[PDB]
Design a protein around this ligand. Structure first.
Ligand SMILES: *[C@@H]1O[C@H](CO)[C@@H](O[C@@H]2O[C@H](CO)[C@@H](O[C@@H]3O[C@H](CO[C@H]4O[C@H](CO[C@H]5O[C@H](CO)[C@@H](O)[C@H](O)[C@@H]5O[C@H]5O[C@H](CO)[C@@H](O)[C@H](O)[C@@H]5O)[C@@H](O)[C@H](O[C@H]5O[C@H](CO)[C@@H](O)[C@H](O)[C@@H]5O)[C@@H]4O)[C@@H](O)[C@H](O[C@H]4O[C@H](CO)[C@@H](O)[C@H](O)[C@@H]4O[C@H]4O[C@H](CO)[C@@H](O)[C@H](O)[C@@H]4O)[C@@H]3O)[C@H](O)[C@H]2NC(C)=O)[C@H](O)[C@H]1NC(C)=O
Ligand SMILES: CCCCCCCC/C=C/CCCCCCCC(=O)OC[C@H](COP(=O)(O)OCC[N+](C)(C)C)OC(=O)CCCCCCC/C=C/CCCCCCCC
Ligand SMILES: CCCCCCCC/C=C\CCCCCCCC(=O)OC[C@H](COP(=O)(O)OCC[N+](C)(C)C)OC(=O)CCCCCCC/C=C\CCCCCCCC
Ligand SMILES: CCCCCCCC/C=C\CCCCCCCC(=O)OC[C@H](COP(=O)(O)OCC[N+](C)(C)C)OC(=O)CCCCCCC/C=C\CCCCCCCC
Ligand SMILES: CCCC/C=C/CCCCCCCC(=O)OC[C@H](COP(=O)(O)OCCN)OC(=O)CCCCCCCCCCCCCCC
Ligand SMILES: CC(C)CCC[C@@H](C)[C@H]1CC[C@H]2[C@@H]3CC=C4C[C@@H](OC(=O)CCC(=O)O)CC[C@]4(C)[C@H]3CC[C@]12C
Ligand SMILES: CCCCCCCCCCCCCCCCCCOC[C@@H](O)COP(=O)(O)OCC[N+](C)(C)C
Ligand SMILES: *[C@@H]1O[C@H](CO)[C@@H](O[C@@H]2O[C@H](CO)[C@@H](O)[C@H](O)[C@H]2NC(C)=O)[C@H](O)[C@H]1NC(C)=O
Ligand SMILES: *[C@@H]1O[C@H](CO)[C@@H](O)[C@H](O)[C@H]1NC(C)=O
Ligand SMILES: *[C@@H]1O[C@H](CO)[C@@H](O)[C@H](O)[C@H]1NC(C)=O
Ligand SMILES: *[C@@H]1O[C@H](CO)[C@@H](O)[C@H](O)[C@H]1NC(C)=O
Ligand SMILES: *[C@@H]1O[C@H](CO)[C@@H](O)[C@H](O)[C@H]1NC(C)=O
Ligand SMILES: *[C@@H]1O[C@H](CO)[C@@H](O)[C@H](O)[C@H]1NC(C)=O
Ligand SMILES: *[C@@H]1O[C@H](CO)[C@@H](O)[C@H](O)[C@H]1NC(C)=O
Ligand SMILES: *[C@@H]1O[C@H](CO)[C@@H](O)[C@H](O)[C@H]1NC(C)=O
Lengths: 1242, 34, 173, 34, 34
């Protein structure tokens, strides 16, 4: 060590002799700091050519240079461009500049200034002068590299670093195009955005992050193969079932041949023009697409005078369909990612029938199994007076009471700000102003006293002190200056004082750690996400910026821009931020219409894939970092200053009487009988739909059976009382719950017998019968274990729940200050247009239009708004879940001063409030929740000592046996037949080649299915019939042949029976299909029977060792998922009955229509399953919030005694919010369960 | 001339010195401008 | 919404009776203009004869002593889009036994298109001197008692049998 | 001196910041050992 | 001032210092005379 010497010519001559000797017969790398062992660079040996410090390739024609920062560089000693030798002064000067840090800083500042200039849609004229400044800097940067090192000579040169390829291409492309001064602007404009990628190479520490993320891809190829294969199987299932179903339409029927004019005229008729003329279809007034229908008994209905036919094109410009494998494959990628899947869910059910809901339940369940694998794949890779006064004030400051009192004032101050609302009376407003004035004075005095107590202005300024001092100055200036008062955001900074509580609330402090990491330890990973989103925003704006305005009439009816577009940077960025939230299909339809499908599909999918990959990596990194690791004394000083004998006649009898009660109650025969009646009475609740009047007989039967059921449960309660005793009976919660349900039933029974059946309280007590199914929770041991596990985590959930509430409270108060009373708008009901500011500017002009008989003009309000903190919480929940957040966001950007008519995007920069909340209140908040759930469920498992918590004792032994059955490797018998002919046939059928022929021919069969299309001509259908026939013939011969060699040993192998049982379905499927196509016609059965052919494609699992190990891991979790699935069904059933009793008559509006409503048990379950994924729960709640004149309080329902179609907003909010929370907790436990099995498997 | 840069004020009555001072829309005393 | 329900069959002499005639249209959001005509065939008579017509929110009663002064509207009101066409007899007499037909003529107004529909609903009313109770209530009332007792004797029977066993075992040792 | 979360590291004398990070024998970059 | 050598142009519509740099339809650029 400590060996330095300038690279002299004799050094090179020695090197070229050294290589001769070697040929005739190392953590020290470039770009890394020199190790401490070598010591500091000599006093004058810095920034010059030196000798290599390692023996690793010491004999190569190489030399080294150093930097004042002790960083290392390596160069090839051969002359640059065959002229510039290392010993020339030409290299030395450029070498001194290339290595200098200041040179890099200029380049970094150059690109940052350049990338900002890329955000301009139409830059001013002088931008060209700035444009040529950049190319001047970039071209100079390359020259220094070229003059300091070789251009492309072997070894280490300019072009041997891949990043310099982009740098060279960027510079040359600018010269050839700009100076030629001709080209397609929208085509070559995008190549400049490559300049943005230069930030990756320049900014330290970003190259490693991107390199890791690129090599992060090759881990997922195993799961990518799985995901594509399964998506193709369900795409073939969905394609077969729903060919042409999404282009059913209600067309006027019968044909009026007299009134028909074909486009050619002549008063003729032409069928092809009939079913393609839009005017012949039915469109529900106010909708944008024609209505779908179906010929089934459970599908949609057409009005009178219309017929259900296949006509026109598929919905959503034709991009939503199952008519082709490519369009079927896209529809299932949408369903896998749950992007707007409720609309595809509802469109398919409206055309294929409600009985097909099973398909969407199945695809949604398995689609969740893919995601767990994808998340686990990436996880596997991150895992005088001055003195006298100073002492006096210092003696009161820093006292625990002073700190304690100020902390209380912070809590009291926050609660004071929550009282602000709209509309607010003058007296209430005055109290808020006076109270707020006092609070600012208290904190102003606090910092002034602490400013004096600590030596003036010097010791006070530290982390927390500067912040609250900044707040105090801001509040004082706001009280003085009108310009400060101009903007509403300033009041929010007071809310940040709430975090001052983190020093005493560990869970709140745990949230600061997560936020701090995102810009601390993981700053570079976060910065890559910022650069990735910026590049996509610029790239999309350049490609599609023009198209969104040229083709505007193609995607909007009014020939004006939609609310989401890429015509400028800010709106381009918002779309990119929107897909990261999971909403990409809706914005891709618009882009495909204007800019074509090929180029739009490619970019939108790269954003979805690359964008979500980086977000997921950041989320997992934050979690794994979270897993890393005087109030009382002040109170103390305040504190300072009967029993009948059993061993006798009756004692034997009475004690024996209690003993026999226990024997009967515990007896399994008795318990099973009671469980049978809990299902019978619970199932009798499903008949109370809007059609009960048509079921006079069934209503009478179930009315009397209710007496029998409630009598039996009374006896069960009495028997349990004696068997256990009052002390034991009233000690456990399960017996308390059963008691409560019985008591409620008796009250409604004796009261009903006495009378008062129409009493309001009794009627509202009758609706509580929906809780009767809760009596089954303790009777099924699968439900009890899951419920017990959930309750054990409640104390942990609550502590994190409080942080969520307090954190969300700040955003709720801040949003109130910005949007309170600014969501109102004047609406012309009869024509359905919000008035423009020219017509009505404020509430006053809207009122003047309401004079007289003008009942069509209304001063309406957006139902979900920020009028107060309570209403703010509901709005935040809709934003956090990304359901209904579009209406909330639209009203915010339109808002103006209170009581002013909204104007289109007058406040466009209010989108940032919702962007900030999603990043902080949703992304980080969910990180905190998962951080404790994972930790809590590990301690819960650990302290119990068991390997499972969602599984019963009976399932555990089955689980243990199944684990072994998947571990004992199969043997390899070779029972040769010892026959002349059967001997040879046995030999070759068992060779690996024979399997390869089978495997390949199945793939050709798979491809033959993808070629099918709805609109295919008969000739193509005729061909595809013969090809499929051959495959059936070929595969039966495979079984017959192997059943001829392995005549009796087939049962010994588990796949041959599957091969056989999959075969006999193929011959029956084709032979029976022909039979049903001529006699006993039943098309709905024909499609289902044809699905048997897809069984062959599943045989690929046999050779897919990559995917088999995960399908097996799925089977391990099924016993646990079954128990959780049961509890979800019970919760769905209970909430289903509540919906029918409350929302069965609300007005058909928004998300409530004639097929998806709460009028019937089937409809309620369909809607409840949809909400389970939190899909479109905003459109179901909105009709329930109606109040007159939006609804009629005395509307008539023919065939029923009910009156009115109004909802109950209070019950509607409680119903939907409660289920959203509950379904979230259960579904989160589902993921934890499957993840635990996979972790124990991997 | 002008009064002190802080003084009580009420809406619809611009008694503070003009045009420098303005009555606030939150509170009951005038405001400064720059 | 709208649910089609059939009318009751037996009307008690001396008191009122409501003849339901509900005909819901396939899609509820559509708008239409409907009017109805009622026709009646008395017991022991073969040909149907009109008895009233309702349209434009005004009821018209045909000249009939058996129905004059004792029939009033009981269906949908306040609109021309009628879906409930019931009528209410204020005083049932034996002249009112017979077959009824409730004709509904509905004209639907679509965009540049209108469809003239027609529906006929049939009702058969029999008059009795005293109200009867439906069989579903008769059979179910006894059944709940049979189930209640048959389950009560079963419970005590098992209690005694197990009481015999437990008491005997305890006294054995 | 330290290597970052995703920095390439040398398993022999890995500089991945302990106790959180450790070199990957199979991927050649620091991972969370947790 | 004038549009430079090879500046964007049409055969009769350049702003360049023509004919010294003057337009042609083969490139729509004021190629410099030589
Ligand atoms: C749900 O269930 C529903 C019920 O099950 C189901 O509804 C059915 O849908 C299908 C379509 O999906 C319907 O079938 C179509 O019906 C069209 C109309 O058919 C009627 O009109 C025809 C033409 O009328 C001319 O001829 C009559 C006889 O001479 C005259 O009386 C007419 O007047 C007229 O002649 C002259 O008079 C006019 C003045 O009055 C004058 O202007 C005019 O120009 C002319 O000079 C009739 O031929 C037809 O009669 C046939 O069919 C009925 C049963 O439907 C039989 O009873 C008859 O005995 C006879 O067989 C009807 O009266 C058809 O036009 C249409 O046919 C065309 O398309 C099909 C393919 O879809 C072709 O096979 C066919 O050859 C026709 O092809 C046309 O285009 C091709 C190019 O592609 C061209 O080469 C060719 O020359 C021709 O132009 C088709 O059959 C069906 O009617 C619906 N109802 C029923 C009950 O079935 C619904 O689909 C289901 N939905 C779902 C989602 O499942
Ligand atoms: C150690 C182990 C211990 C285990 C102990 C047991 C734990 C698990 C069970 C707990 C029991 C919780 C039950 C609480 C239910 C309260 C609901 C309630 O009091 O509601 C009442 C309201 C009243 O309505 P109204 O009279 O105004 O209607 C008027 C309508 N007119 C006009 C037609 C009459 O009802 C409505 O509003 C209807 C809409 C609102 C519905 C709210 C939710 C109701 C259902 C809850 C199901 C809970 C399932 C839990 C599963 C397990 C999870 C872990
Ligand atoms: C790192 C990660 C990188 C990811 C990169 C992903 C790249 C994807 C590239 C997709 C390229 C698509 C090329 C075909 C475009 C084209 O020109 O296509 C033509 C056909 C014709 O259709 P048509 O006859 O109905 O005419 C239209 C009639 N109209 C409008 C009424 C419906 O359109 C079709 O079939 C269009 C079918 C397109 C289906 C694409 C599904 C992709 C799904 C997921 C990919 C990720 C997993
Ligand atoms: C999935 C992720 C889960 C994340 C969990 C984290 C956070 C929790 C969020 C909970 C949301 C709370 C919503 C509260 C609510 O709904 O705000 C009170 C409502 C809305 O105010 P407004 O629109 O009526 O104001 C009208 C004002 N004007 C007339 C001036 C316009 O006010 C009313 O009417 C009161 C109506 C009754 C509201 C009951 C809410 C029940 C909530 C929880 C149930 C328990 C769940 C667990 C089991
Ligand atoms: C008792 C109750 C429990 C109470 C506790 C609940 C906890 C939270 C309450 C609400 C959270 C759960 C609701 C939810 O589901 O939404 C969260 C979502 C789950 O998946 P989603 O499919 O919904 O989101 C689309 C996935 N692509 O996570 C997300 O991705 C949110 C979207 C954020 C990602 C978009 C871009 C942001 C990346 C950058 C952000 C940080 C960058 C660093 C800046 C310094
Ligand atoms: C975390 C969540 C659950 C916060 C919930 C807070 C509630 C205690 C607040 C927030 C919204 C409040 C409601 C907002 C508006 C109104 C209308 C208000 O109407 C009137 O006063 C009548 C008209 C008048 O002002 O004279 C009656 C109280 C009420 C229901 C409020 C009751 C108390 C609520 C539910
Ligand atoms: C576990 C808790 C629930 C146990 C009970 C589970 O069964 C009850 C329902 O699933 C069945 O209800 P139905 O489909 O019979 O109701 C509708 C019937 N009609 C009206 C269509 C004929
Ligand atoms: C709709 O159809 C009804 C009958 O189905 C028409 O009413 C009849 O009209 C004719 C005249 O065309 C009269 O002679 C009959 O007496 C009417 N019968 C009844 C019961 O009213 C009605 O006019 C048709 N409406 C339209 C617009 O075509
Ligand atoms: C179109 O109308 C013209 C004018 O009568 C006629 O000559 C021609 O045959 C028509 N074409 C068709 C395809 O009906
Ligand atoms: C569609 O039908 C209407 C009604 O007959 C007609 O006015 C219109 O011209 C037709 N359009 C086309 C494209 O055939
Ligand atoms: C509301 O719209 C209707 C229909 O276009 C129009 O007649 C009416 O004048 C509008 N109201 C006002 C106040 O302009
Ligand atoms: C409402 O706006 C009008 C002009 O559109 C204006 O003259 C009037 O003073 C405003 N009134 C209020 C209360 O804002
Ligand atoms: C029916 O009319 C009779 C007279 O014919 C009268 O006595 C009786 O009270 C009436 N009852 C009703 C319900 O109209
Ligand atoms: C009923 O029929 C009898 C038959 O004689 C007749 O006298 C009577 O007027 C009819 N009407 C009534 C209301 O009784
Ligand atoms: C039917 O007529 C009776 C006659 O008094 C009336 O009380 C009742 O309200 C009517 N019912 C309807 C639905 O119009």
């Amino acid at each position: 060590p400590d060996s330095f010497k300038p690279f002299t010519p004799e050094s090179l001559a020695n090197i070229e002799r050294r290589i001769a000797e070697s040929k005739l017969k190392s953590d020290l790398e470039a770009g890394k700091s020199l190790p401490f062992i070598y010591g500091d660079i000599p006093q004058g040996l810095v920034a010059v050519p030196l000798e290599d410090f390692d023996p690793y390739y010491l004999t190569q024609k190489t030399f080294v240079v150093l930097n004042r920062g002790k960083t290392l560089f390596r160069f090839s000693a051969t002359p640059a461009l065959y002229i510039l030798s290392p010993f020339n002064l030409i290299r030395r000067i450029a070498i001194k500049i290339l290595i200098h840090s200041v040179f890099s800083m200029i380049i970094m500042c150059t690109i940052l200034t350049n990338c900002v200039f890329m955000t301009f849609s139409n830059p001013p004229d002088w931008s060209k002068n700035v444009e040529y400044t950049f190319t001047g800097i970039y071209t100079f940067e390359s020259l220094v590299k070229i003059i300091a090192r070789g251009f492309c000579i072997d070894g280490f040169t300019f072009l041997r670093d891949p990043w310099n390829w982009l740098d060279f291409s960027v510079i040359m492309m600018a010269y050839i195009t700009e100076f030629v001064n001709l080209g397609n602007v929208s085509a070559l404009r995008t190549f400049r955005v490559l300049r943005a990628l230069k930030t990756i190479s320049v900014i330290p520490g970003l190259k490693t992050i991107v390199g890791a993320l690129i090599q992060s891809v090759k881990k997922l190829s195993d799961v990518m193969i799985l995901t594509v294969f399964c998506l193709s199987v369900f795409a073939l299932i969905g394609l077969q079932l729903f060919m042409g179903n999404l282009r059913n339409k209600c067309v006027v029927w019968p044909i009026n041949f007299n009134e028909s004019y074909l486009e050619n005229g002549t008063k003729g008729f032409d069928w092809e023009e009939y079913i393609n003329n839009k005017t012949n279809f039915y469109t529900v007034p106010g909708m944008l697409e024609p209505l779908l229908c179906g010929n089934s008994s459970d599908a949609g209905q057409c009005p009178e005078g219309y017929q259900c036919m296949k006509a026109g094109r598929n919905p959503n410009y034709g991009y939503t369909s199952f008519d082709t494998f490519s369009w079927a494959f896209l529809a299932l990628f949408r369903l896998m990612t749950q992007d707007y899947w409720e609309n595809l869910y509802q469109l398919t059910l409206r055309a294929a029938g409600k009985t097909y809901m099973i398909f969407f339940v199945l695809v949604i369940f398995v689609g969740s199994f893919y995601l767990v694998n994808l998340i686990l794949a990436v996880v596997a890779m991150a895992y005088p007076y001055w003195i006298k006064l100073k002492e006096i004030v210092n003696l009161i400051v820093m006292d625990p009471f002073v700190d304690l009192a100020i902390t209380i004032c912070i809590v009291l101050n926050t609660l004071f700000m929550a009282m602000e609302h709209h509309p607010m009376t003058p007296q209430f407003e005055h109290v808020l102003a006076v109270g707020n004035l006092v609070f600012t004075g208290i904190f102003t005095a606090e910092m002034f006293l602490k400013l004096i107590a600590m030596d003036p202005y010097y010791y006070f300024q530290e982390g927390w002190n500067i912040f609250d001092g900044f707040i105090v100055s801001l509040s004082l200036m706001e009280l003085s200056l009108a310009d400060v008062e101009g903007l509403s955001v300033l009041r929010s900074f007071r809310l940040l004082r709430v975090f001052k509580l983190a020093k005493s609330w560990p869970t709140l402090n745990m949230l600061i750690k997560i936020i701090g990491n995102s810009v601390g330890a993981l700053g570079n990973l976060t910065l890559v996400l910022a650069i990735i989103v910026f590049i996509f925003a610029v790239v999309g704006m350049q490609l599609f910026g023009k198209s969104y305005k040229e083709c505007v009439c193609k995607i909007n009816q009014d020939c004006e821009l939609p609310r989401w577009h890429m015509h400028d940077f800010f709106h381009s960025f918002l779309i990119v931020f929107r897909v990261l939230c999971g909403e990409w299909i809706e914005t891709m339809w618009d882009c495909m219409e204007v800019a074509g499908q090929a180029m739009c599909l490619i970019v939108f999918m790269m954003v979805m894939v690359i964008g979500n990959l980086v977000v997921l990596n950041l989320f997992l990194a934050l979690l794994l970092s979270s897993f890393s690791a005087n109030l009382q004394i002040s109170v103390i000083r305040i504190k300072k200053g009967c029993q009948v004998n059993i061993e006798e006649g009756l004692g034997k009898s009475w004690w024996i009487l209690r003993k026999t009660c226990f024997l009967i109650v515990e007896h399994n025969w008795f318990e099973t009988f009671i469980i049978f009646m809990i299902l019978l009475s619970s199932g009798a609740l499903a008949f109370e739909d809007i059609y009960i009047e048509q079921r006079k007989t069934i209503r009478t039967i179930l009315e009397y059976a209710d007496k029998v059921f409630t009598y039996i449960f009374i006896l069960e309660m009495l028997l349990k009382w004696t068997a256990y005793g009052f002390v034991k009976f009233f000690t456990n919660a399960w017996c308390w719950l059963d008691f409560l349900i019985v008591a409620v039933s008796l009250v409604s029974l004796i009261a009903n017998a006495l009378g008062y059946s129409e009493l309001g309280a009794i009627k509202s007590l009758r609706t509580l019968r929906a809780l009767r199914p809760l009596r089954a929770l303790s009777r099924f041991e699968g439900m009890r274990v899951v419920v017990n596990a959930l309750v054990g985590a409640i104390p942990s959930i609550m502590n994190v729940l409080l942080v969520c509430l307090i954190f969300w409270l700040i955003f709720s108060i801040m949003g109130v200050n910005l949007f309170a009373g600014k969501y109102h708008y004047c609406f012309n009901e009869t024509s359905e247009i919000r008035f423009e500011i020219e017509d009505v500017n404020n509430k006053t002009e809207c009122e003047k239009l309401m004079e007289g008989n003008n009942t069509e003009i209304r001063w309406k309000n957006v139902k979900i708004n920020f009028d107060n903190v309570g209403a703010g919480y509901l709005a935040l929940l809709q934003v956090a879940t990304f359901k209904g957040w579009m209406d909330i966001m639209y009203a915010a950007v339109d808002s103006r001063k209170p009581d002013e008519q909204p104007k289109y995007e007058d406040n466009i920069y209010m989108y940032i409030y919702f962007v900030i909340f999603i990043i902080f209140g949703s992304f980080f908040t969910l990180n905190l929740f998962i951080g404790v759930i994972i930790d809590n469920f590990n301690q819960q498992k650990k302290k119990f000592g068991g390997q499972d918590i969602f599984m019963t004792e009976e399932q555990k032994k089955y689980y243990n046996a199944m684990k072994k059955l998947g571990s004992k490797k199969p043997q390899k018998p070779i029972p040769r037949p010892l026959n002349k002919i059967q001997g040879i046939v046995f030999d070759f059928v068992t060779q690996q080649a024979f399997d390869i022929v089978i495997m390949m021919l199945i793939c050709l069969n798979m491809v033959t299915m993808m070629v099918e299309t709805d609109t295919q001509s008969k000739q193509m259908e005729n061909i595809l019939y013969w090809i499929n026939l051959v495959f059936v013939i070929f595969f039966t011969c495979e079984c017959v042949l192997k059943m001829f060699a392995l005549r009796h040993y087939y049962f010994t192998i588990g796949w041959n029976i599957f091969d056989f049982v999959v075969v006999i379905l193929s011959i029956v499927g084709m032979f029976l299909a022909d039979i049903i196509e001529k006699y006993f016609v039943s098309p709905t059965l024909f499609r289902v029977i044809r699905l048997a052919r897809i069984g062959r494609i599943l045989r690929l699992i046999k050779g897919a060792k990559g995917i088999r190990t995960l399908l097996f891991a799925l089977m391990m979790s099924l016993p646990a998922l079954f128990n959780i699935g049961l509890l979800l069904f019970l919760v769905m059933f209970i909430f289903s009955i509540f919906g029918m009793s409350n929302f069965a008559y609300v007005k058909h509006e928004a998300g409530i229509d004639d097929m998806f409503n709460f009028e019937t048990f089937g409809n309620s379950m369909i809607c409840l399953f949809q909400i389970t994924t939190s899909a479109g729960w905003d459109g179901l709640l909105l009709p329930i919030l109606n109040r007159p004149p939006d609804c009629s309080l005395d509307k008539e329902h023919p065939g029923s005694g009910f009156k009115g179609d109004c909802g109950n907003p209070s019950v509607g909010i409680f119903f939907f919010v409660s289920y959203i929370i509950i379904s979230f907790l259960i579904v989160v436990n589902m993921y934890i369960a499957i993840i635990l099995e996979n972790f124990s498997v991997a | 001339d002008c009064l002190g840069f802080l003084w009580k004020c009420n809406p619809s009555n611009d008694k503070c010195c003009r045009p420098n001072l303005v009555c606030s829309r939150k509170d009951k005393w005038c405001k400064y401008q720059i | 919404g709208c649910v089609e329900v059939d009318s009751e069959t037996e009307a008690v002499y001396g008191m009122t009776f409501k003849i339901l005639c509900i005909s819901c249209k396939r899609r509820s959001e559509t708008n239409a203009e409907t009017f109805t005509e009622w026709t009646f065939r008395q017991k022991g008579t073969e040909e149907f004869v009109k008895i009233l017509r309702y349209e434009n929110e005004v009821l018209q009663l045909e000249e009939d002593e058996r129905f004059e002064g004792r029939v009033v509207w009981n269906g949908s009101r306040g609109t021309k889009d009628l879906q409930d066409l019931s009528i209410f007899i204020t005083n049932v007499t034996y002249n009112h036994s017979g077959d009824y037909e409730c004709h509904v003529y509905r004209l639907l107004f679509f965009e540049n298109y209108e469809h003239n529909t027609s529906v006929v609903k049939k009702i058969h009313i029999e008059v009795v001197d005293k109200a009867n109770r439906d069989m579903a209530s008769i059979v179910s009332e006894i059944m709940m008692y049979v189930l209640i007792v048959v389950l009560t004797i079963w419970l005590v029977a098992e209690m005694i049998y197990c009481y015999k066993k437990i008491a005997a075992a305890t006294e054995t040792a």
